[PDB]
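dumping the sequnces here before i forget
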Amino acid sequence: VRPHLRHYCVVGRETPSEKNPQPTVYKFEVFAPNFVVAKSRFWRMMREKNKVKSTHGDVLSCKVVKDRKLAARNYSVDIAYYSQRCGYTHMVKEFRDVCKAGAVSQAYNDLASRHRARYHNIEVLGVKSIPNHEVRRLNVAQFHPHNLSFPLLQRRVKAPRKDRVIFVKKNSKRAVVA
Amino acid sequence: VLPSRRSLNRSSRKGFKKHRPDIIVIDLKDHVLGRAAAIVAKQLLLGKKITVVRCEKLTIAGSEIRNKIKYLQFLRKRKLSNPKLGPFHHRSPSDVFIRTVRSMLPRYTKRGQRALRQLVAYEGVPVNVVRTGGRVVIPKAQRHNCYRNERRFTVLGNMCKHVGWKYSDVVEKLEAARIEKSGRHHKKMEKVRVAWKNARKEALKKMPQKNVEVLKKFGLA
Amino acid sequence: KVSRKSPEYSTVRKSCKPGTIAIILAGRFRGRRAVILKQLPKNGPLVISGPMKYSGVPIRRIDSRYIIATSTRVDLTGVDTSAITPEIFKRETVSDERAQLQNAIDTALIQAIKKDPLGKEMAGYLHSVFTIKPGDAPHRLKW
Amino acid sequence: LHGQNKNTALVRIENVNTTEDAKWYVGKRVCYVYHGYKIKRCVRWSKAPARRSNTRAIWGRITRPHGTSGTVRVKFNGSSVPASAIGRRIRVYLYPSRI
Amino acid sequence: VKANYIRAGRLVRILRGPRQNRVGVIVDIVDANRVLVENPCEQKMWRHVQNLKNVEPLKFCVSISRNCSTKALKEALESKKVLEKYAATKSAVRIAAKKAFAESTDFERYQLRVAKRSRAYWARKIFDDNDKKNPVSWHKVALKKLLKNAKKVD
RNA sequence: UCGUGACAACGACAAUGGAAGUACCUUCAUUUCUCGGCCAGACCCAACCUCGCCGCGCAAUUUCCUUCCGGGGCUAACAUCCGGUGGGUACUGUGCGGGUUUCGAGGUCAUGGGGUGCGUGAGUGGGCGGAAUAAAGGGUCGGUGGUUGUGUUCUUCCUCCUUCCCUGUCCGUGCGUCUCGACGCUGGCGAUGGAAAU
RNA sequence: GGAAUGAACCGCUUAGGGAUAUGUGGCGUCAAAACUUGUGGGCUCAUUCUCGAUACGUGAAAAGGGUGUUGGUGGAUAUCCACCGGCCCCGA
RNA sequence: UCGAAUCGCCACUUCUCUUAUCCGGUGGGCUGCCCGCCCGGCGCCCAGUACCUUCAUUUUCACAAGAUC
Ligand SMILES: [Mg+2]
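..and the predicted 3d for all of it:
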């Protein structure tokens, strides 16, 4: 519900014709805000790989995939982003999340803050739920142990929107103004 | 202020003795300077009378060296041909707060000038403000909801000293005297506070049996 | 279905019913409570008469937009209120014919309130006065 | 940013702070109370002579909420409210009542 | 320093959500600022994600393991009777009282007003007759000073 | 261009100017005075615009859920993870609905009315009158043979009966050439005055 | 109508007026709007022409450096080496 | 002389300090769990929850036609 970038599976093919009857049917996994963007990414991949353009092809399915459950997991996401003066950069990162869509949305925000890369310059190669004992990052492995505990400090507690005072008495909750 | 003979004579005929307008007193200890000024300025424009005390305890984000340099840059500005017409650089903490609030008001219309007239801005808690009533705070600028713990901050009084203010010792001497007098008085009347508390208790078992149940249902007894 | 020409026709809120306690919001009796008795034959104003002993509000007419109908109701099956007719208000010290009508209806209203199981609490309730204190919100209440 | 339009006024009421609370007050009557400098005509000038005074009132109604913090929009009958009322008290009555 | 620790089996109360002022037990921790909350002995409150800025830890704890079954959690809660103890806490009663006032029907509001007035009157009567003997108020203390001052002249 | 008497005020934004109100002045105009072309408030009909509450279709809900094992992992276990076994039968999408044999409310100082009352001042209404009482048009079940498509039988859709379940049917009112005019109920103010109102 | 200001930029193009909704641009105060919205993530500390923050707007910056801090890639060993990014600092 | 706008008040609030902090203080047992100990208020229509008690014709809104100063 919270994450953007839903999980889409796009199935398509080149239109049947002479000199190429019964063309191959391809499958594509993409993470996009809506199915219009999902189909746009599918044809960009088809154009640069199979030399097939959207004008001469058709889409057979634009289904939304379903995830397993609501447990805590480890996700490995290998991603690539383009920039000038550096070309293409490939990396593998690990995240903690609940579903594949959430992990990939985290990765997109992470690349924005740490490397200043926008959505259309980023290509996702794969996402997989890996077990413990084979994650290579300490910022993820520190949540594995049982009996894990920590306190909440430096909290900023804001009141519900209905209460929301402006001036309050020094030694009481009297709410002088508003 | 300073009622002339016209005012005293009119009050004598009419029978009036005293009058006090509705005023809010804000304790400015541990408050972010910019956030408190913005909240107060909007309330002034909405027709409120505000008195702020302890203006020497306002805090500014950053180190004391950084903020002192910022003031020395402001002090450098003056009308070269006639400095007595140029910008005026006030030095007391209470004057600095009023200047900050003034820059957040339309100060060249009669509406803004009237709004600025409704702020007093004392230093410490003077004798004419101690017994007026309970003080208030602004939770949106309390600096324990605003600053991260590890960041250095400046106290306004310390920064106002070292650039020209020469009443820091006077203010701290008067504040310490106020604490002792207020502390002595508050320890007194502990008997009447306890007596009233022992009166609300045992008031139950004297009230009718139905009103106590209603009090229990609403979590008041 | 009821024709608009017929006297029984009326378009008033379902909250305002005979026997309902109401808070008067305007006029010389603002802030007091009274019992709604009936409605005038056409789509006219309601007739409110709180017990004169309790709230000191006599029989008069009021618009439904100047009261707040509370959720506490007193049964009025015993009372008749058939003597209340528009011409008694059309006539425009108190005449004694008005006094006898007010006194007779008041006794029936008082007896009906006493018949209610919470009669003593209701009598004290009708004595109270509504006001807006500094720091309360009438829009968050439930009535 | 281009200037003001004086046929509508903005009123801030105590203890609303929410759009849902401001929607309770749509349609309610509003008045602004001030005084003149002599006794002019008033309602019930002949039936209730005790009412005669320098006090005067300008009435209006609440049309719709403004923003998300509980401010409302008010139209003052045909004319507009004077600009000397900015920052002063406004009365918000409880009638007409839907409750 | 004295904070209650965030861990599996710790009861929390929700601050500002749709399920405001509700209690559930933490069952797992995912990253720094997200947990899974569940309470099987109350309507709604199935397993769901909750931000750590929207909960407050309580003093009560239940011995369970991370990612435990719903039937295992239900058994653990009833054995320790933790939910009943929270209901007896003063913080819970204050919250329950505020909800009761929001539902009031202007007749119970009058009844509460009568009850408070009755207590205030009796407190005033109790405070006096403890001021006649062992005076404590401002006026009763000054009466002794006045009487002794007038003894010599009168 | 200047003097004088009366008055209005006014800090310093040079004045002048525009818009919208207000406070005092009016040798101005129009209306009313026992009905009013004055000021308010509520109500009705039509129209337009909103909010609550309740729902539907689609393989969208199976790249999924649950049990019993073999790996693997932690700690004694469980869990995250990978292969198999038998059961399956609030949920991250998309297109839409709901007042008249009645689904609950709100607003128009942002609209027109004679506000059903006289005559040609044309209530058109599933809404106003008269009649009649499931009227044709849908949702499931069980059978019934033609059809689309996988795979070497079952899967859709049709037409034809059988069970229950839901809803709402028919009729009716042109003017003797054309146009404009007609402003209900309640209170305040106004009874000829250096009067009210615009 | 917006970009504080500007012939030419952004939006839109113009009879006299109401109601509703938008565009560009915005919602700490000046100044209408989050009375300082989120029950969303990260990164950053900037001492003397004073860190940064609306395009056109060279309406001001380069080569070259810094484990200051936060991320990646490729090799040895159960920490070391080489290289490349983000924000900040020197060059100024 | 003045007709005016404003509509809570208190000798229980009117002392101080912290927010990585026993949020009322405060000890003990085995680096987080468990176990003990002691101590804002009034105000809204009988001076008070109880019997009794004048409200009008100001007969449908209008600055509260009433108060404070
Ligand atoms: Mg604003």
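Residues 1-3, 5, 7, 61, 113-118, 120-125, 137-139 of chain E lie near RNA strand H (CB under 10 Å from a C1').
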